[PDB]
């Protein structure tokens, strides 16, 4: 007749010797058919020897029906080894606090276990809903092989998948902790990463670890922030200082209910859970506790206990669990680092919804950022150099300023008109300067030169010029699209291997190209002879080379075919011309040079063909580019 | 002085302790004594698990082991019975290296952070059925897994594999433990029409598989079978079919020599161990020690990385997740319902043995593996003829310019030659034709072609609202489904391309102009560009050339003069520049230099613009195009094309003309 089950709930730690003994028990809603027994008893240290022990100790024929587990530590591990218990035993158990409320590998389904301690998959929607609080839109993960993992992956994957706000993933890291790292892995993995807002998940101790090599690594600093899960926050009585300040992360609080009133919460839990399944089948759940001997008969129907205790209520109050073993939703504290050791709370969450109380700071350009420094080098017609009007002071009319360290130079010309239609459709500002070190781009043995430099030094953002394109600089920088047909070309007066050999021809045959040039280099990668042979005929500067040309002592010059064409109309006496239809082999156009895959990018290359779009530059070809010889045409 | 580094370890019997104990001190003796000794220390499997972790932390821990082995108990209870070690030792990081668990659970390094074995999973297996697989040439496979972390860890490695290659999942199959009746799933099975068959699952279950698979009649010839070590062992052995292939592990069943092999590794990894400095000695005892072991995972970074590729059970290296990596497996075969050894695998090779193969129901040699195709095409003269069967016998014998007879097959397609237009049966023959056909020798398939009914191949047209109808012609029938595959001409570009996967290119052709020789410079020919009323320029409206005319911005204003007087079929605008209606003709090479050497009288002008290519039509969901392009590269390095080309492109009389 008088149904009075068996249970027995153990305290470790308490911070006592002569911790607490049986506050609690007392009885309260006496009303539930079944009556509680209870033994109570305490350890002061976590063993898996003294653990398993003493719990099947106090099985022994006492016959326990359910057991509640509480601890002072910050331990991990705990929770999974009374689960494994559990998974022996058929005997339910769960916790209250510290390690066994923090998470664990998802629970085998046969196995009875819970924990008060939030789900992985709720703990991640609280840091997106955070993250979404101050709109920190931009984010990454580093994570451990611990437990859980994947399970996060895919929470937050879904969690972020369905809102409709723009926000970026951008790493994710699995390292392991186990093959304990000489090679700094981890450091050498997390220097990688850019991005503002970190989620970390990991064991208590790991993230000390993950946190000294961040201090090394310099990501704990100055605008990125870290946002953490309960596990590495743990109790919260104890913080290594090697976490960093201004840390952020969620935890159940030890002030709105102290741990006996949670106690009486796990009590309440499994003599509700009795008194359900006396209601359904009028039947005793009491069973032999022994672990060493078989599991008790008909302790194998327990599987509907499980399937009753899922979700209970008392005192208005929903211990609601999830298949995990979780509770669906605990009440739960936004906490952080505030300045020293202090875990002061920030935030109070429960259920659908989320509460924060700090406005703003916590702890310039809305379309787009930053500013971009420009190099380039003088060549006509398409960028000039003038020396501007020293009466004036300043530049004049369509001449925008460019400086050289060695004194204010006025750039303009085809580049600078380029360049300013692209800023005025594209609308952002820009600085402009002259190279210094090797003009265009050059090689000597293993280091680049010249504007491509400052574009690999970040002196500059973009080079914009006469600058050919070559399949090596195009793998170093990405290259705007050609605006005009050019490339390789000749310009006499007046394949057939009269360039291959000069020697063939008894007089002496005589070509030459400026040094240093994306032609010479050319040159060189496809034909040795030639080059080997031109380096006598190279010369000094365009206009120079033009001398050799002009007043005799050089037959042929060879060039860009634009400039070469430009120069082909434009002539003191037409006494100069482009080779054949001028139709050039190499076919190339000028390019602009960007960083790399990173940059503003497909944005520009739309802008230049709008240019071609609206036809101006045909306009821009008559007024900069046209000559006036080829007059017979 | 000597230091007494402790092992540990739990087998199967007593005699087997003593055999860990001559290996252990082999180890001492054989490696330096002065510096290091190694002490040996085990215990028997215990009734459950706890009264056996209590003992590693009674007996074993409190001799401060450095690592742990273990082994599967002489009656095996549930699986993996090695469980609670992992978990034990792994609280304070202490190495564990099983034996005889071949278990795939033990694989996740996230739930078992400790566990090494010497022997690989029955995941790991699957490393010889992509070898198995990349020998004989099928693809194309079905796998059958029970769902348990086993069975979804199997299906994930090979997988794996085949993600190297295009992902092939042909099919996969999911069944549940336990379950006496599967017909179902095997009735799903038969459909799919891959004929080749791979599962995994235990020996209870297994038995059910077969004694299921077997009603069905799935062990019949041109179906395969390839299994795990636990398949054809057991009852599962005595209800298992005929002609069968089946793997077993080497020295799978020993404990002892694996035993003298992991600990000589354990050896060489503590005596390279203790070259390195700032080491610890594993907690004393369980009892007071909440805190893990930090040499630990060093210990087992060494001992996965500790080579000595000379053993007693064969080469020895680790993968990742602590699992043994280049182990050797014995393929069986179940002929006269007997187990034989029709070849043995060691390393990444697979080896033959002298033994004859068999496969299931009788074959001397059979490897056999893997229902209607509607197709359909357009009148384009070069790569399609048309002729209707005369009467109603069938084709002409007639014979092409090098002696061959002339294939032919029948095609059913519009008619213009009565005045209402029937679909009409009609006789067919072509290059494409001659192609398909080899493929159909090549490929499973077999095929039924009738033309479509617009003479057009497609383009998009009509209605306004939302996005109405869909491109008329061939292409239209491919979406459609009244042709599954589209063979003929067919240029291909990215506005159709998004719509449906695409063939590799059978031809290599760009568009070009035809004008009578007997008296334009480029793609861009001034006396286009310098259009003329007295000089026209002819095209077909709809043809794919009006699409690039269409879709491209930068000679957008070109289009236009092209689109007046533009003619509505190939043989049309052949004839307007024959019989000198109009000046010029432009369209894509292949169709048209074919004609170019047919009269001679026209001549073909300039460089291929719109390069492109030709290729057969077919949805991205079918997965035969997969096959179509492997084959049309097959045909192409042979010369077949080349051939072929050769022979349906006469270049019998023209030349330059100039």
Not at chain 1, 537 to 566: C, E, H, M, T
Not at chain 2, 202 to 227: C, I
Not at chain 2, 240 to 253: H, R, S, T, V
Not at chain 2, 441 to 460: I, N, P, S
């Amino acid at each position: 007749k008088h149904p009075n089950m068996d249970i027995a709930v153990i305290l470790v730690g308490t911070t006592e010797e002569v911790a607490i003994k049986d506050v609690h028990e007392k009885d309260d809603f006496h009303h539930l058919p079944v009556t509680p027994r209870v033994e109570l008893v305490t350890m002061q240290e976590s063993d898996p020897k003294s653990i398993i022990t003493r719990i099947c100790d106090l099985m022994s024929d006492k016959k326990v029906q359910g057991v509640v587990f509480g601890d002072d530590t910050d331990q991990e591990a705990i929770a999974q080894i009374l689960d494994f218990i559990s998974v022996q035993t058929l005997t339910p158990i769960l916790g209250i606090h510290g390690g066994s409320s923090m998470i664990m590998a998802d629970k085998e389904e046969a196995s009875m276990f819970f924990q008060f301690g939030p789900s992985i998959e709720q703990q991640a929607s609280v840091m997106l809903n955070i993250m979404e609080e101050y709109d920190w839109y931009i984010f990454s993960i580093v994570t451990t092989y611990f437990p859980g993992y994947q399970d996060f992956e895919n929470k937050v994957r879904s969690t972020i998948e369905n809102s409709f706000v723009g926000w970026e993933l951008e790493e994710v890291i699995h390292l392991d902790m186990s093959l304990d790292d000489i090679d700094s892995k981890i450091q050498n993995q997390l220097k990688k990463l850019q991005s503002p807002v970190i989620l970390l998940y990991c064991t208590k101790e790991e993230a000390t670890y993950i946190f000294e090599v961040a201090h090394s690594v310099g990501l704990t600093g100055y605008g990125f922030t870290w946002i953490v899960p309960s596990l590495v926050a743990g109790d919260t009585d104890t913080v290594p200082d090697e976490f960093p300040t201004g840390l952020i992360s969620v935890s159940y609080d030890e002030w709105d209910y102290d741990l006996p009133a949670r106690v009486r919460d796990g009590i309440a839990i499994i003599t509700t859970a009795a008194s359900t399944m006396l209601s359904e089948h009028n039947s005793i759940p009491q069973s032999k506790s022994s672990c060493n001997n078989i599991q008790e008969s008909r302790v194998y129907e327990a599987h509907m206990l499980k399937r009753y205790l899922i979700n209970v209520t008392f005192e208005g109050r929903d211990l609601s669990f999830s298949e995990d073993g979780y509770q669906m939703h605990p009440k739960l504290v936004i906490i952080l680092l505030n300045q020293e050791r202090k875990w002061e709370r920030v935030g109070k969450y429960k259920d659908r919804s989320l509460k924060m109380w700090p406005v703003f700071d916590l702890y310039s350009e809305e379309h787009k950022d930053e500013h971009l420094s420009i190099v380039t080098l003088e060549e006509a017609p398409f960028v000039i150099v003038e020396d501007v009007d020293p009466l004036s002071g300043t530049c004049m009319r369509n001449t925008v300023p460019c400086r050289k360290q060695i004194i204010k130079r006025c750039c303009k010309g085809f580049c600078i008109d380029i360049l300013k239609k692209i800023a005025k459709t594209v609308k952002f500002t820009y600085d402009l300067y002259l190279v210094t070190n090797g003009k265009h781009g050059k090689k000597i043995n293993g280091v680049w030169n010249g504007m491509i430099g400052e574009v690999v030094t970040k002196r500059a953002y973009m080079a914009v010029g006469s600058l050919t394109i070559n399949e090596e600089r195009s793998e170093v920088v990405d290259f705007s699209v050609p605006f005009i047909e050019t490339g390789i070309s000749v310009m006499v007066s007046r394949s057939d291997k009269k360039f291959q050999r000069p020697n063939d021809f008894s007089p002496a045959f005589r070509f030459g190209t400026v040094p240093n040039g994306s032609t010479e280099r050319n040159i060189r990668n496809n034909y040795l002879e030639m080059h080997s042979y031109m380096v006598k005929f190279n010369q000094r500067s365009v206009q120079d080379a033009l001398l050799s040309l002009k007043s005799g002592k050089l037959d042929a010059f060879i060039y860009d075919a634009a400039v070469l064409n430009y120069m082909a109309g434009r002539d003191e006496g037409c006494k100069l011309v482009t080779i054949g239809s001028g139709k050039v082999f190499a076919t190339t156009g000028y390019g602009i040079a960007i960083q790399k895959d990173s940059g503003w990018k497909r944005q520009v290359d739309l802008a230049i063909l709008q240019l071609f779009g609206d036809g101006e530059m045909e306009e821009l070809e008559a007024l900069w580019l046209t000559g006036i010889c080829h007059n017979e045409k | 002085d000597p230091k007494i580094v402790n092992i540990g370890a739990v087998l199967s019997t007593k005699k087997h302790e003593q055999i860990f104990r001559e290996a252990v001190n082999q180890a001492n003796f054989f490696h330096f004594t002065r510096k290091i000794q190694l002490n040996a220390t085990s215990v028997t499997h215990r009734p459950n698990a706890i009264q056996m972790a209590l003992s590693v932390c009674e007996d074993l821990i409190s001799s401060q082991v450095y690592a742990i082995l273990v082994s599967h108990p002489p009656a095996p209870t549930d699986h993996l019975t090695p469980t609670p070690i992992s978990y034990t030792a792994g609280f304070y990081r202490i190495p564990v290296i099983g034996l005889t668990t071949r278990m795939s659970i033990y694989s996740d390094k996230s739930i078992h952070l400790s566990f090494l074995r010497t022997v690989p999973p029955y995941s790991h297996q699957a490393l010889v059925w992509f070898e198995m697989m990349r020998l004989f040439n099928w693809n194309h496979v079905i796998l059958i897994v029970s769902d348990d972390h086993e069975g979804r860890a199997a299906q994930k490695k090979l997988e794996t594999l085949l993600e190297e290659k295009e992902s092939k999942a042909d099919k996969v199959l999911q069944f549940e433990p336990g379950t006496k009746n599967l017909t179902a799933l095997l009735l799903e099975a038969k459909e799919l029409e891959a004929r080749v068959i791979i599962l995994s699952a235990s020996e209870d279950d297994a038995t059910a598989v077969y004694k299921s698979a077997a009603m069905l009649d799935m062990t019949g010839a041109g179906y395969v079978w390839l299994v795990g070590e636990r398949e054809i062992s057991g009852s599962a052995l005595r209800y298992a079919p005929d002609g069968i292939i089946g793997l077993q592990l080497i020295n799978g069943k020993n404990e002892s020599a694996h035993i003298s092999d992991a600990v000589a590794v354990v050896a060489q990894a503590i005596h390279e161990l203790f070259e390195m400095e700032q080491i610890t000695d594993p907690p004393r005892g369980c009892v007071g020690n909440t805190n893990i072991w930090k040499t630990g995972p060093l210990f087992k970074r060494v001992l996965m990385s500790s080579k000595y590729p000379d053993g007693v059970t064969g080469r020895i290296e680790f993968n990742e997740d602590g699992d043994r990596k280049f182990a050797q497996y014995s393929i069986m075969n179940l002929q006269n319902r007997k187990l034989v050894q029709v070849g043995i695998f060691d390393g990444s090779y697979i080896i033959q043995n002298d033994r004859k193969i068999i496969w299931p129901g009788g074959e001397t040699e059979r490897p056999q593996g893997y229902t209607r195709l509607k197709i359909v095409t357009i009148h384009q003269e070069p790569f399609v003829y048309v002729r209707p069967t005369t009467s109603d016998g069938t084709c002409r014998e007639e014979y092409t310019i090098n002696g061959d007879p002339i294939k032919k097959v029948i095609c059913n397609g519009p008619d213009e030659t009565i005045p209402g237009r029937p679909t009409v049966p009609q006789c067919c023959y072509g290059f494409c034709v001659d192609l398909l056909i080899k493929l159909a020798r090549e490929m499973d398939f077999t095929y039924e072609v009738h033309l479509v009914a617009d003479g057009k191949f497609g383009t998009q047209e009509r209605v306004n609202n939302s996005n109405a109808a869909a491109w008329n012609g061939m292409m239209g029938e491919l979406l459609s489904g009244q042709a599954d595959m589209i063979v003929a001409p067919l240029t291909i570009n990215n506005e159709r391309a998004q719509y449906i996967e695409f063939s590799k290119p059978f031809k290599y052709q760009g568009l070009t102009i035809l004008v009578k020789k007997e008296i334009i410079t480029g793609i861009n020919d001034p006396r286009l560009r310098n259009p003329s009323d007295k000089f026209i320029y002819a095209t077909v409206k709809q043809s794919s050339v009006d699409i690039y005319f269409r879709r491209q911005v930068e000679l957008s204003t070109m289009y236009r003069h092209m689109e007046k007087h533009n003619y509505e079929s190939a043989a049309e605008a052949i004839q307007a520049v024959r019989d000198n209606k109009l000046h010029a003709f432009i369209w894509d090479s292949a169709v048209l230099e074919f004609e170019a050497s047919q009269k001679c009288d026209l001549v073909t002008t300039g460089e291929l613009f719109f390069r492109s290519g030709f290729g057969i039509g077919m949805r991205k969901d079918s997965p035969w195009k997969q096959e179509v392009s492997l084959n049309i590269l097959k045909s192409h390095e042979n010369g077949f094309m080349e051939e072929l080309d050769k022979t349906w492109v006469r270049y019998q009389e023209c030349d330059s003309r100039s």
